[PDB]
Amino acid sequence: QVQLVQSGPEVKKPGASVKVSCKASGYTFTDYYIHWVRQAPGQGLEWMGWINPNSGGTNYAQNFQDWVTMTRDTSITTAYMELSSLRSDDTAVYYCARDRITTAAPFDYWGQGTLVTVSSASTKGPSVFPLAPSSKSTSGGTAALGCLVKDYFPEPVTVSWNSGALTSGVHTFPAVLQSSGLYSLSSVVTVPSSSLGTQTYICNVNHKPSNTKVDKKVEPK
Amino acid sequence: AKVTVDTVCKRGFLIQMSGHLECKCENDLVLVNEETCEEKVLKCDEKTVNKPCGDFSKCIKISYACKCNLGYDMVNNVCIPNECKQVTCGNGKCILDTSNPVKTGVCSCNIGKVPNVQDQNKCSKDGETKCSLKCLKEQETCKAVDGIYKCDCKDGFIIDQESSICTGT
Amino acid sequence: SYVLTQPPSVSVAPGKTAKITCGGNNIGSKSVHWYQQKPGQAPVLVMYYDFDRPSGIPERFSGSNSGNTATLTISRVEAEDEADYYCQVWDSDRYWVFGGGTKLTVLGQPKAAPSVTLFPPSSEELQANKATLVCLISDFYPGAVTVAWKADSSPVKAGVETTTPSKQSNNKYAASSYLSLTPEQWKSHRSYSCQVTHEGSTVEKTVAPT
């Protein structure tokens, strides 16, 4: 079975460099080009170039050679793409793909892609604040309460409620990216108003990149 | 209908290149399918409908016209596989490769030439190619004629039309 | 450079036929390949050398290429065909070219008005000398809102950060908007408002210092 398995996601500072691998298997490595394709978030596919596993030759798309080096290791059938002097604008998913060495052959197999995230922000745990239920967040006998997960970097954070025992009515929202480079997100849960005096509600926030867990009790104001 | 060393080229004969075999027609005949050869039609008319007007091309009624068969494109007045529409080879031709589920157009080269892997597998590299045709007719053997392998008369023998068999010493 | 032009978006009803075009100068002479990409996934080959259909691709997908327009035709469009579609040609000047991409939207999904929840800044945050208002927007379709904030009855001038809409598990969309204030700006006004506009109709929630 033909497979292209890329390396995992990367988070980098401007000025750094990153090297993404593309592990090939299930086919004669030297019979196929390895292409690299760039996709900035929300954008289209952008051919960056190919490398010939045989001769090691390269064919870079217009001006990508200024900061991209494509190499290969026939010994372990892996191609590499090294991005140099990273800038925040280089943030994108990077794909590898193969096509038969010939003219105009289609890219019949693609790697899963590697997300390269470039940001001047530094790793930072979130400040978790309660979003108290009140009569202004209560509609027809059900109250909304939640947690504000503020000013963290990088993605991701997980939110559960009551250590997973509460999932009905929970809506954790995708994060906003602020102009400071830090993320914030919110998780809200709707519950019966009649339970606010007896049922304790705690959001369990986990930000593994800073090794930070926060269990925030959410009480009526 | 793949072409191998055991294929019967009706009204034609087998040829071999760097990476494949195919049938070449005799005299002024054209290919109807991969291993049959029939007389062509010069002017497509109403009587010529569905008759061969070229290699892999029949006359169709729009009305008269000579269009390529399904899966073939007319590139430079010759019907070639659609996957080869953009593949130029130089010292060879483009063939349809089916070794993978996704088909590709790959170059197959004149005898003495091989796909140059550093030149998009175009026919720009010198390389050996051993003949595999079964030349079993009397006083015949595989020779390199005009860039292709074919069963031809052994040295000192010519085809006489009184018997159509290689004759001489 | 060789230019492939695709329409940015195409919309069709379920069961109808969809046509995605790929324009190019004499593109009939080039072998056009088509790739489908669904969110979160790598591109997938769905058509190659103008009209060869890969194994596993439904027969509803057909390709064509003549003159100055290669076309990917999807008859009897299903909801699963909703994705981005990219054409691709090779130019003999030694470079590959992807088209701009076409978003295919399968219509039929009923419109749905957003549900809006607005939270004021917590005591903990105020006591940390910061203030954030949280406007949570859910269960709308189609997936496009406009959010506007108000200090009392006048539009704010700064501090607004709004997410793009994202699809929910129930195929509706969600978004959220955050208003950053100082605790002094929060206590000096009588109230603040989050106005969510969706398909010409507005839903506004208001909170006030307590």
Numbering used by the authors:
A (entry chain C): 1 to 52, 52A, 53 to 82, 82A, 82B, 82C, 83 to 100, 100A, ...
B (entry chain A): 1 to 62, 68 to 174
C (entry chain B): 1 to 9, 11 to 95, 95A, 96 to 210
Wording from the paper:
We obtained the structures of four site 1a antibodies, 1190, 1262, 1269, and 1276, in complex with Pfs25 to 2.4, 2.7, 2.5, and 2.2 Å resolution, respectively; and two site 2 antibodies, 1245 and 1260, in complex with Pfs25 to 1.9 and 3.3 Å resolution, respectively. Site 1a mAbs 1190, 1262, 1269, and 1276 recognize the EGF-like domain 3 of Pfs25 and compete for largely overlapping recognition sites. MAbs 1190 (plasmablast-derived from Kymouse E-80-1c) and 1276 (memory B cell-derived from Kymouse E-80-1a) are part of a mAb pair, and differ by eight H-chain and 14 L-chain residues. Of these residues, two in the HCDR2 (Thr/Asn53 and Asp/Ser54) and one each in the LCDR2 (Tyr/Phe52) and LCDR3 (His95B/Arg95) contact Pfs25. Accordingly, 1190 and 1276 demonstrated similar interacting buried surface areas (BSA, 1136.8 and 1104.0 Å2) and hydrogen (H)-bonding networks (17 and 14 H-bonds, respectively). In addition, their H- and L-chains contributed almost equally to Pfs25 contacts and BSA. The slightly greater BSA and H-bonds of 1190 compared to 1276, likely explain the higher affinity 1190 exhibits compared to 1276 (6.7 nM vs. 16 nM). Thus, 1190 and 1276 bind to Pfs25 similarly, and approach Pfs25 from the same direction, contacting predominantly EGF-like domain 3 residues, but also residues 75, 76, 77, and 78 from the EGF-like domain 2. In mAb 1190, a S54D mutation in the HCDR2 leads to an additional H-bond, while both 1190 and 1276 each have an S52F/Y mutation that introduces van der Waals contacts with multiple EGF-like domain 2 residues, and ensures that Asn87 adopts a favorable conformation to H-bond with other LCDR2 residues. The mAbs also showed a range of BSAs to both predominantly single-domain (antigenic site 1a) and more elaborate multi-domain (antigenic site 2) epitopes, as well as recognition modes that employ equal H- and L-chain contributions (1190 and 1276), or H-chain-dominated interactions (1245, 1260, and 1269).
